Design a protein around this motif. Structure first.
Motif, PDB file in Angstrom:
ATOM      1  N   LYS A 467       0.817  -1.213   0.000  1.00 19.52           N
ATOM      2  CA  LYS A 467       0.000   0.000   0.000  1.00 19.52           C
ATOM      3  C   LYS A 467       0.858   1.275   0.000  1.00 19.52           C
ATOM      4  O   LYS A 467       0.568   2.230  -0.734  1.00 19.52           O
ATOM      5  N   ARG A 468       1.905   1.325   0.828  1.00 18.08           N
ATOM      6  CA  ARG A 468       2.737   2.531   0.879  1.00 18.08           C
ATOM      7  C   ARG A 468       3.446   2.784  -0.455  1.00 18.08           C
ATOM      8  O   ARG A 468       3.487   3.921  -0.938  1.00 18.08           O
ATOM      9  N   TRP A 469       4.027   1.736  -1.052  1.00 18.81           N
ATOM     10  CA  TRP A 469       4.665   1.854  -2.366  1.00 18.81           C
ATOM     11  C   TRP A 469       3.685   2.361  -3.426  1.00 18.81           C
ATOM     12  O   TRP A 469       4.037   3.205  -4.267  1.00 18.81           O
ATOM     13  N   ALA A 470       2.445   1.853  -3.403  1.00 21.67           N
ATOM     14  CA  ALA A 470       1.476   2.216  -4.427  1.00 21.67           C
ATOM     15  C   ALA A 470       0.915   3.611  -4.197  1.00 21.67           C
ATOM     16  O   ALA A 470       0.616   4.322  -5.164  1.00 21.67           O
ATOM     17  N   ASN A 471       0.769   4.023  -2.940  1.00 23.25           N
ATOM     18  CA  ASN A 471       0.386   5.409  -2.692  1.00 23.25           C
ATOM     19  C   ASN A 471       1.512   6.349  -3.099  1.00 23.25           C
ATOM     20  O   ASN A 471       1.257   7.437  -3.633  1.00 23.25           O
ATOM     21  N   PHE A 472       2.763   5.928  -2.899  1.00 28.99           N
ATOM     22  CA  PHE A 472       3.876   6.736  -3.379  1.00 28.99           C
ATOM     23  C   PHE A 472       3.821   6.888  -4.887  1.00 28.99           C
ATOM     24  O   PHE A 472       3.936   7.997  -5.408  1.00 28.99           O
ATOM     25  N   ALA A 473       3.654   5.781  -5.606  1.00 28.71           N
ATOM     26  CA  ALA A 473       3.576   5.866  -7.058  1.00 28.71           C
ATOM     27  C   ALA A 473       2.367   6.698  -7.493  1.00 28.71           C
ATOM     28  O   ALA A 473       2.486   7.593  -8.338  1.00 28.71           O
ATOM     29  N   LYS A 474       1.199   6.444  -6.906  1.00 25.87           N
ATOM     30  CA  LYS A 474       0.004   7.149  -7.358  1.00 25.87           C
ATOM     31  C   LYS A 474       0.042   8.628  -6.967  1.00 25.87           C
ATOM     32  O   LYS A 474      -0.277   9.498  -7.784  1.00 25.87           O
ATOM     33  N   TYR A 475       0.426   8.932  -5.722  1.00 21.78           N
ATOM     34  CA  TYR A 475       0.203  10.256  -5.151  1.00 21.78           C
ATOM     35  C   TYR A 475       1.469  10.927  -4.621  1.00 21.78           C
ATOM     36  O   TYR A 475       1.383  11.995  -4.006  1.00 21.78           O
ATOM     37  N   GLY A 476       2.635  10.338  -4.826  1.00 22.24           N
ATOM     38  CA  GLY A 476       3.830  10.939  -4.282  1.00 22.24           C
ATOM     39  C   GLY A 476       3.955  10.923  -2.777  1.00 22.24           C
ATOM     40  O   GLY A 476       4.845  11.594  -2.247  1.00 22.24           O
ATOM     41  N   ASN A 477       3.121  10.172  -2.067  1.00 19.54           N
ATOM     42  CA  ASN A 477       3.167  10.177  -0.603  1.00 19.54           C
ATOM     43  C   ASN A 477       2.973   8.765  -0.051  1.00 19.54           C
ATOM     44  O   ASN A 477       1.898   8.190  -0.217  1.00 19.54           O
ATOM     45  N   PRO A 478       3.980   8.155   0.597  1.00 20.05           N
ATOM     46  CA  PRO A 478       3.918   6.726   0.933  1.00 20.05           C
ATOM     47  C   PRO A 478       3.217   6.432   2.263  1.00 20.05           C
ATOM     48  O   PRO A 478       3.726   5.684   3.112  1.00 20.05           O
ATOM     49  N   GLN A 479       2.044   7.019   2.456  1.00 23.08           N
ATOM     50  CA  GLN A 479       1.271   6.782   3.663  1.00 23.08           C
ATOM     51  C   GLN A 479       0.381   5.559   3.496  1.00 23.08           C
ATOM     52  O   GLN A 479       0.046   5.146   2.383  1.00 23.08           O
ATOM     53  N   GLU A 480       0.029   4.968   4.625  1.00 18.29           N
ATOM     54  CA  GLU A 480      -1.058   4.001   4.741  1.00 18.29           C
ATOM     55  C   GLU A 480      -2.082   4.723   5.587  1.00 18.29           C
ATOM     56  O   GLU A 480      -1.841   4.954   6.774  1.00 18.29           O
ATOM     57  N   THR A 481      -3.182   5.149   4.975  1.00 19.94           N
ATOM     58  CA  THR A 481      -4.061   6.106   5.642  1.00 19.94           C
ATOM     59  C   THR A 481      -5.233   5.462   6.367  1.00 19.94           C
ATOM     60  O   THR A 481      -5.894   6.135   7.163  1.00 19.94           O
ATOM     61  N   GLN A 482      -5.508   4.185   6.137  1.00 22.35           N
ATOM     62  CA  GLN A 482      -6.766   3.650   6.634  1.00 22.35           C
ATOM     63  C   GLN A 482      -6.652   2.872   7.938  1.00 22.35           C
ATOM     64  O   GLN A 482      -7.663   2.694   8.613  1.00 22.35           O
ATOM     65  N   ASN A 483      -5.472   2.406   8.322  1.00 25.97           N
ATOM     66  CA  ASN A 483      -5.383   1.433   9.403  1.00 25.97           C
ATOM     67  C   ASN A 483      -4.608   1.975  10.600  1.00 25.97           C
ATOM     68  O   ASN A 483      -3.889   1.239  11.282  1.00 25.97           O
ATOM     69  N   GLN A 484      -4.775   3.271  10.886  1.00 29.09           N
ATOM     70  CA  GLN A 484      -4.064   3.941  11.981  1.00 29.09           C
ATOM     71  C   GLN A 484      -2.556   3.679  11.922  1.00 29.09           C
ATOM     72  O   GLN A 484      -1.907   3.406  12.935  1.00 29.09           O
ATOM     73  N   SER A 485      -1.992   3.749  10.719  1.00 27.69           N
ATOM     74  CA  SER A 485      -0.572   3.489  10.553  1.00 27.69           C
ATOM     75  C   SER A 485       0.249   4.680  11.038  1.00 27.69           C
ATOM     76  O   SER A 485      -0.235   5.808  11.139  1.00 27.69           O
ATOM     77  N   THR A 486       1.508   4.405  11.360  1.00 24.44           N
ATOM     78  CA  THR A 486       2.478   5.464  11.605  1.00 24.44           C
ATOM     79  C   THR A 486       2.612   6.334  10.364  1.00 24.44           C
ATOM     80  O   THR A 486       2.827   5.830   9.257  1.00 24.44           O
ATOM     81  N   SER A 487       2.496   7.641  10.544  1.00 22.36           N
ATOM     82  CA  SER A 487       2.741   8.550   9.435  1.00 22.36           C
ATOM     83  C   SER A 487       4.226   8.565   9.080  1.00 22.36           C
ATOM     84  O   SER A 487       5.089   8.610   9.959  1.00 22.36           O
ATOM     85  N   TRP A 488       4.523   8.508   7.781  1.00 20.73           N
ATOM     86  CA  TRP A 488       5.903   8.503   7.304  1.00 20.73           C
ATOM     87  C   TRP A 488       6.359   9.943   7.089  1.00 20.73           C
ATOM     88  O   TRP A 488       5.895  10.590   6.138  1.00 20.73           O
ATOM     89  N   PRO A 489       7.236  10.489   7.932  1.00 24.20           N
ATOM     90  CA  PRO A 489       7.643  11.887   7.764  1.00 24.20           C
ATOM     91  C   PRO A 489       8.569  12.062   6.581  1.00 24.20           C
ATOM     92  O   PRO A 489       9.278  11.144   6.172  1.00 24.20           O
ATOM     93  N   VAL A 490       8.541  13.270   6.021  1.00 22.97           N
ATOM     94  CA  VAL A 490       9.507  13.644   4.994  1.00 22.97           C
ATOM     95  C   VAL A 490      10.924  13.670   5.588  1.00 22.97           C
ATOM     96  O   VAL A 490      11.133  14.085   6.739  1.00 22.97           O
ATOM     97  N   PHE A 491      11.907  13.219   4.808  1.00 20.18           N
ATOM     98  CA  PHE A 491      13.318  13.236   5.213  1.00 20.18           C
ATOM     99  C   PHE A 491      13.958  14.550   4.781  1.00 20.18           C
ATOM    100  O   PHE A 491      14.061  14.822   3.585  1.00 20.18           O
ATOM    101  N   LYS A 492      14.400  15.359   5.739  1.00 25.53           N
ATOM    102  CA  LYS A 492      15.120  16.585   5.424  1.00 25.53           C
ATOM    103  C   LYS A 492      16.541  16.493   5.945  1.00 25.53           C
ATOM    104  O   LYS A 492      16.827  15.763   6.898  1.00 25.53           O
ATOM    105  N   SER A 493      17.433  17.266   5.317  1.00 23.02           N
ATOM    106  CA  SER A 493      18.843  17.231   5.697  1.00 23.02           C
ATOM    107  C   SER A 493      19.055  17.666   7.144  1.00 23.02           C
ATOM    108  O   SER A 493      20.086  17.333   7.738  1.00 23.02           O
ATOM    109  N   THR A 494      18.096  18.377   7.729  1.00 20.15           N
ATOM    110  CA  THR A 494      18.228  18.803   9.119  1.00 20.15           C
ATOM    111  C   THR A 494      17.955  17.652  10.081  1.00 20.15           C
ATOM    112  O   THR A 494      18.858  17.159  10.765  1.00 20.15           O
ATOM    113  N   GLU A 495      16.701  17.219  10.151  1.00 15.36           N
ATOM    114  CA  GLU A 495      16.304  16.249  11.154  1.00 15.36           C
ATOM    115  C   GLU A 495      16.552  14.813  10.716  1.00 15.36           C
ATOM    116  O   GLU A 495      16.779  13.953  11.572  1.00 15.36           O
ATOM    117  N   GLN A 496      16.526  14.533   9.414  1.00 15.93           N
ATOM    118  CA  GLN A 496      16.861  13.209   8.893  1.00 15.93           C
ATOM    119  C   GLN A 496      16.009  12.106   9.529  1.00 15.93           C
ATOM    120  O   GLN A 496      16.514  11.074   9.980  1.00 15.93           O
TER     121      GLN A 496
END
Ligand SMILES: *[C@@H]1O[C@H](CO[C@@H]2O[C@@H](C)[C@@H](O)[C@@H](O)[C@@H]2O)[C@@H](O[C@@H]2O[C@H](CO)[C@@H](O)[C@H](O)[C@H]2NC(C)=O)[C@H](O)[C@H]1NC(C)=O
Ligand SMILES: *[C@@H]1O[C@H](CO[C@@H]2O[C@@H](C)[C@@H](O)[C@@H](O)[C@@H]2O)[C@@H](O[C@@H]2O[C@H](CO)[C@@H](O)[C@H](O)[C@H]2NC(C)=O)[C@H](O)[C@H]1NC(C)=O
Ligand SMILES: C[N+](C)(C)CC(=O)N/N=C/c1cc(CNNC(=O)C[N+](C)(C)C)nc(-c2ccccc2)n1
Ligand SMILES: *[C@@H]1O[C@H](CO)[C@@H](O)[C@H](O)[C@H]1NC(C)=O
Ligand SMILES: *[C@@H]1O[C@H](CO)[C@@H](O)[C@H](O)[C@H]1NC(C)=O
Ligand SMILES: *[C@@H]1O[C@H](CO)[C@@H](O)[C@H](O)[C@H]1NC(C)=O
Ligand SMILES: *[C@@H]1O[C@H](CO)[C@@H](O)[C@H](O)[C@H]1NC(C)=O
Ligand SMILES: [Cl-]
Ligand SMILES: [Cl-]
Ligand SMILES: [Cl-]
Length: 527
Positions: A467-496
């Motif tokens: 699901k995360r891979w396919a949401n990434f491909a479809k929408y640019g965002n690798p979330q799993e939104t329906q099953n109370q999943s951990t939100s995947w934060p964006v990786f920035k050079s600061t906080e990493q």
């Protein structure tokens, strides 16, 4: 009967049953003229339209390549060896589309790895029928030339310009652009994804201008072009072309007549001599790989990356917990897949000699110094685990993290994962851990097959990853939104921040392998 009219002619697929539904498979569509005879070592030529119904009902030939013969009869190694006939006639690709035929499906294009010297899209772990069935995406995979037949380089010279395997890949991406709407695919919503040299290839498509317009987004599993094995320099590239020529008795002064000579050689003769073009090698040696050819690659890729010259888009990047262990049982002393491989300090030092042959004494000393200040100092597997971390941190993790930092610094959303689940069906022993390449079956959804003896928790993890891979491909965002999943934060050079993938608890962590990567990325390139 499903026949699809493509730009070069009609093709017939098969229907397959998957999880009480249907996927349509077109296995083995040609996408180029066979690169035989005077076409060997040249860029792929475009294909001449056919008037029949091409039957795309069986995987095509795999490209010529040496095979892993180190563990005959062992599934852990043999699961990666080609499962179709080897041939030079191998420029083919595969399509899985959902049934019923979709309307504007996102397309996933897989690029296999194999060190640029082995691999094939027909492998069981690259079967796209699961993703097509479950996520309603279209999955495309292609064979591309490897070894000298795909990367021999006499730079400047179009008889052997280098990078042919990369151009095979690119001509396949082009085929998707011209043809996928006929299969129900959206050519404007294409995500490349690949593993190992496949990931490095995906990252080189992000830099190649000729590929900019052929895909939308990119997924990099355990690999990137800035890894030390991924790009050959022009100087050693021609050393290797020349060394191969003397080995086959094809030494000439006309550089072009050398190629003509090598074109009369049988594929087997070229294959047996590929290993010896280098004076010393390692289990990670890439004798013939990507080069700065001035065509696919216009400049040194480190420079382009550092200066922001690449496709602006989202990327998804990740690595496995034990990337380096697989290579230890292909040469390091004291190691074996059939015992716990507990090694001494001297065996570790001998091990560094095998993985860093051209490196100075002080350089090897410096690796030992940073990886052997133990907490306990009494644990017997200290040196066994250190050598694996050395090989994994230097060859995969630290380059992947540095690619992600540099790419995201130009404003693009990036997502980083750390895969730390060991497959319950992994055939290698436990001490090798979460090996290189053993997230692939989870990405392709094999544990969704209840009959394939995966645990329930592995099914759940695979369903989440898919699901995360396919949401990434479809929408640019690798979330799993329906099953109370951990939100995947964006990786920035600061906080990493990065996300951990395991059956237990997915967690947000920061700054993977901080102390190790400072060593590899800031000290070691100087030695
Ligand atoms: C560049 O190539 C030369 C050619 O040597 C090859 O060595 C073997 C790999 C074999 O396959 C043959 O094609 C060639 O003989 C390398 O020079 C050799 O270096 C090694 C020692 O490091 C040793 O075999 C000989 O002393 C050298 N042979 C000759 C003929 O000079 C060279 O090391 C290669 N690499 C670089 C960076 O120059
Ligand atoms: C783990 O095994 C290695 C591999 O050697 C062989 O491996 C097995 C398949 C077994 O069936 C035997 O043939 C061998 O033991 C061992 O490495 C060997 O170690 C001894 C000396 O220490 C010697 O036979 C060789 O020099 C080594 N071979 C190598 C390095 O390739 C290793 O000692 C074993 N470790 C443990 C903890 O049992
Ligand atoms: C990750 N996964 C599972 C997809 C890989 C895979 O399926 N096959 N892997 C192949 C491979 C081989 C070599 C070198 N072989 N050299 C030899 O003499 C061996 N022989 C006999 C000629 C085959 N190097 C690398 C490699 C190099 C750098 C980074 C990563 C991998 N990969
Ligand atoms: C293609 O498939 C059809 C359907 O079974 C078969 O009748 C035909 O002979 C095949 N064509 C070739 C060239 O094999
Ligand atoms: C598919 O979507 C693209 C934009 O993503 C759109 O331009 C195109 O017309 C669509 N094609 C369909 C719905 O067949
Ligand atoms: C021999 O080399 C010359 C350049 O010196 C080149 O133009 C020519 O094409 C080569 N011979 C053949 C038969 O191609
Ligand atoms: C979400 O949970 C349901 C069960 O409530 C399960 O059937 C489904 O496959 C899960 N979806 C994902 C994407 O994990
Ligand atoms: Cl860890
Ligand atoms: Cl010690
Ligand atoms: Cl340091």
């Amino acid at each position: 009967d499903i026949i699809i009219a493509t730009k070069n002619g009609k093709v017939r697929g098969m229907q397959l049953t998957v999880f009480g539904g249907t996927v349509t498979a077109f296995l083995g569509i040609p996408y180029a003229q066979p690169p035989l005879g005077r076409l060997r070592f040249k860029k792929p030529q475009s294909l001449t339209k056919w008037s029949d119904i091409w039957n795309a009902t069986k995987y095509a030939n795999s490209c010529c390549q040496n095979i892993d013969q180190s563990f005959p009869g062992f599934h852990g190694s043999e699961m990666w060896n080609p499962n179709t006939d080897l041939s030079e006639d191998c420029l083919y690709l595969n399509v899985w589309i959902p049934a019923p035929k979709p309307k504007n499906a996102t397309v996933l294009i897989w690029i296999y790895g194999g060190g640029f010297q082995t691999g094939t899209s027909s492998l069981h772990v690259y079967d796209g029928k699961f993703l097509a069935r479950v996520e309603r995406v279209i999955v495309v995979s292609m064979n591309y030339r490897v070894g000298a037949l795909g990367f021999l380089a006499l730079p400047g010279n179009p008889e052997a310009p280098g990078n042919m395997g990369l151009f095979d890949q690119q001509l396949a991406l082009q085929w998707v652009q011209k043809n996928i709407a006929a299969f129900g695919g959206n050519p404007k919503s294409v995500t490349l994804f690949g593993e190992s040299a496949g990931a490095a290839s995906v990252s080189l498509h992000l830099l190649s201008p000729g590929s900019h317009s052929l895909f939308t987004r990119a997924i990099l599993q355990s690999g990137s072009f800035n890894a030390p094995w991924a790009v050959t320099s022009l100087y050693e590239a021609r050393n290797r072309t020349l060394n191969l020529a003397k080995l086959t008795g094809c030494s000439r002064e006309n550089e072009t007549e050398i190629i003509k000579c090598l074109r009369n050689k049988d594929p087997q003769e070229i294959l047996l001599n590929e290993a010896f073009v280098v004076p010393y090698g390692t289990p990670l040696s890439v004798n013939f790989g990507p080069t700065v050819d001035g065509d696919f690659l216009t400049d040194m890729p480190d420079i382009l990356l550092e200066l922001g010259q690449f496709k602006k888009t989202q990327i998804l990047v990740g690595v496995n917990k034990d990337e380096g262990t697989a290579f230890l049982v292909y040469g390091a002393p004291g190691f074996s897949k059939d015992n716990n491989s507990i090694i001494t300090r001297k065996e570790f030092q001998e091990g560094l000699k095998i993985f860093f042959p051209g490196v100075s004494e002080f350089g090897k000393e410096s690796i030992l110094f940073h990886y052997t200040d133990w907490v306990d100092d009494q644990r017997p597997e200290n040196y066994r685990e250190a050598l694996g971390d050395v090989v994994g941190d230097y060859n995969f993790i630290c380059p992947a993290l540095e690619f992600t930092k540099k790419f995201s610094e130009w404003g693009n959303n990036a997502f980083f994962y750390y895969f730390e689940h060991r497959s319950s069906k992994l055939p290698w022993p436990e001490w090798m851990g979460v090996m290189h390449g053993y997230e692939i079956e989870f990405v392709f959804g094999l544990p969704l097959e209840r009959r394939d003896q995966y645990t329930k928790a592995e099914e759940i993890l695979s369903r989440s990853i898919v699901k995360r891979w396919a949401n990434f491909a479809k929408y640019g965002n690798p979330q799993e939104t329906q099953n109370q999943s951990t939100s995947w934060p964006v990786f920035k050079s600061t906080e990493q921040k990065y996300l951990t993938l395991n059956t237990e608890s997915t967690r947000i962590m920061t700054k993977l392998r901080a102390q190790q990567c400072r060593f590899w990325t800031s000290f070691f390139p100087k030695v």
